[PDB]
Symmetry: D3
Subunit: 156 residues, 6 copies
């Protein structure tokens, strides 16, 4: 039995992009996940338009509405909310997604790189989370039996 | 005559944040549609009146975190409007979450950006949860009895 | 003394609808439990004040649709009661949706049927979302501070 | 992997009944759907009583409560909300179901007959929808990867 | 000046329950933050004014059950605070459900325990749904305009 | 196709413990249920601590928070809410869980021992329920096609 996820992860910095690649490698190796039918944002850009190459779309409200809608739709139609979370580079966008996931009754799992696990995270991030784990535990996490636990680290 | 209460969503972690905080609070004091005395201000409602900047021993205390987290949620759900003091270059993951929770509890979500920054690009998901976004100089006068959807007059990254 | 605000759910697409609209609005003006000045009337809150009956160029405009749709939702969620002016022979898919959304946001859903039609069969799902349904002549006097569940005195098809 | 649906469709008119038969034929041929475990209203009439043959049940409040409850239960316990939507014969009942589906966090898909696709639909119908498609696209729609898109047609 | 309305969650099935009921109602009469006249009291809002203790013929009536059940839900969702008069040795499955429903509709959930019993262990899930729990002698004076999360000063079994 | 459940059942009395064992035997024999990936509270005690043997944990707020959270998490991440319901020993805890299940859009099924089916149940328990059945019908209940029905018994 496999569960699908929403791949909540930033792609703006070096530490973010590192964590992204690690978490995606982890999922490819996790037998409880259906990655092919999961919602990965970067593979679901509206009408395939790459906003790096056409920044004129940052002032287009239809572009924004669809992208925003598609990402929410990604969360609500999948089983688990995954949040790749960097403590020194905390993301207001991911913050919002975690709130939305809560409201749609999803398990919220945060994944922190092991080099950073233990470091202080925002109180509300701590709170929305059902659990938070090290990146090394993601390859083996049992998504069929997901459970509540506390972060073993600081919170501000 | 009719007054609404708010939840004062705002960071206090940087200089620009602290500045925005002071400005927005002065704004509300002067707004005749707001009951500020019965509004929820987080910093006045941390568990046992203690903040972890001033008492770092509480960084690892799970009782303090549980109650503070719960009280902040309780603040959002029992007040009429969700207010988010928002700095575009210093966006807060905490406030991000609060905006989502406010959405789920059916509150008007209003962002307030300092005038010096209004127009600057904001995160897509912040744009989206928002019902409306205004300059800090509009906050003294905003009519909270007739709150409306509008699009931000600025970019989104 | 205590007053509630409403969302004025009503079609404007037919003659009977437009008649019902005018009657219900006069009713609310005279109801002492309602604050009509701070209530949400859709027709006064379309995006950019423009309606697509009067400006058909907006039929294919997605910005206009997004904002109007959002503002109507915002109208429901930030007011106390969901009011649905309901014609049984001219039932509105738009109002149908609004009734569902109001349910999800925990509002009292009140239907008002013109007296000439009260008793006529209404759609099952409209019956079901409703907390209560009344004749137009009851609307001037309805006590919105003590709203109650009751069954429609009529059929359902 | 198969998803289940709620078959939201009127049966009161000729155009409605045509659309019904087409959409059901479409689903029978769609490999991403489990139709056997989907909720089809007309196959789930309370205590098998046919209201055509016994209209005395239209004044029975217990009959109405159960039917109304069963239909909502149909929406909440299935994966996708399907709405067969005729633009010239818009249904207040379907309208309500779409709102309920939104509130229960389901993908809302509308299906319009191709002869009608493009014609004006109500604004709120447009809004609740995650996507709207032509009847001919239903046989092949991928329900494992459902996405946000705008109707390519008018709205009042 | 600002007043909130409540839903009077309380059993009436035992002597201790009936005692607690009378005490809590006297408390609210004297609380200046409450509008009791516009609050929802279940016992005054059963379908057709009839209670099944006094008319056991209604034990098997599904119309009576549907409307009463609906009206009780409607009571919770259209009032500001969820109040639960709670006896630890006589815990009520009905009130248990109401507390959950109140949570889902985003209401402050306040439990009131008789002073003679405050401190006694309460069910885990009751503890958890609750925002706060107080002694009956605190109820006359509780400020419902500034309701806060707090932990019960007692055990949980 | 199998659905998972949350095993809502008391363990404090003789009648409760009897009903528990019967309902669990029933599920083991039901082909529509995945019991291995269901949430059974007693197998999910926080950090394996047995509160019978260490009652000092009844005054620990972290223990309570995690247990309470894990049980809610159990309800929200499974498909069906099962409530083993004894009419003479009605549980305020189960009451709350049923409300939560409703709010998360789950089918709520109550199971009453046959020796008790028919006996009066609380109005609000009746109301939250989508259906209520005899313990003997649980071995064969079709959880892929769950439907609305009324309790055939009294309510106070």
């Amino acid at each position: 039995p496999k569960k699908t996820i929403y791949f909540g992860a930033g792609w703006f910095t070096d530490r973010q992009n590192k964590a992204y690649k690690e978490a995606m490698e982890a999922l490819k190796e996790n037998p409880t996940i259906d990655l092919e039918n999961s919602y990965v944002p970067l593979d679901n850009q509206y009408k395939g338009i790459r906003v790096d190459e056409h920044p004129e779309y940052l002032h287009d409200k239809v572009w924004a509405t669809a992208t925003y809608n598609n990402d929410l739709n990604g969360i609500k139609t999948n089983d688990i909310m995954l949040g790749v979370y960097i403590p020194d580079e905390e993301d207001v966008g991911l913050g919002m997604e975690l709130g939305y996931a809560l409201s749609q009754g999803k398990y919220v799992l945060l994944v922190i790189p092991d080099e950073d696990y233990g470091k202080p995270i925002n109180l509300m991030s701590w709170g929305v989370s059902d659990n938070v784990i090290k990146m090394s535990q993601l390859k083996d996490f049992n998504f069929n039996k997901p459970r509540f636990d506390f972060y073993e680290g600081a919170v501000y």
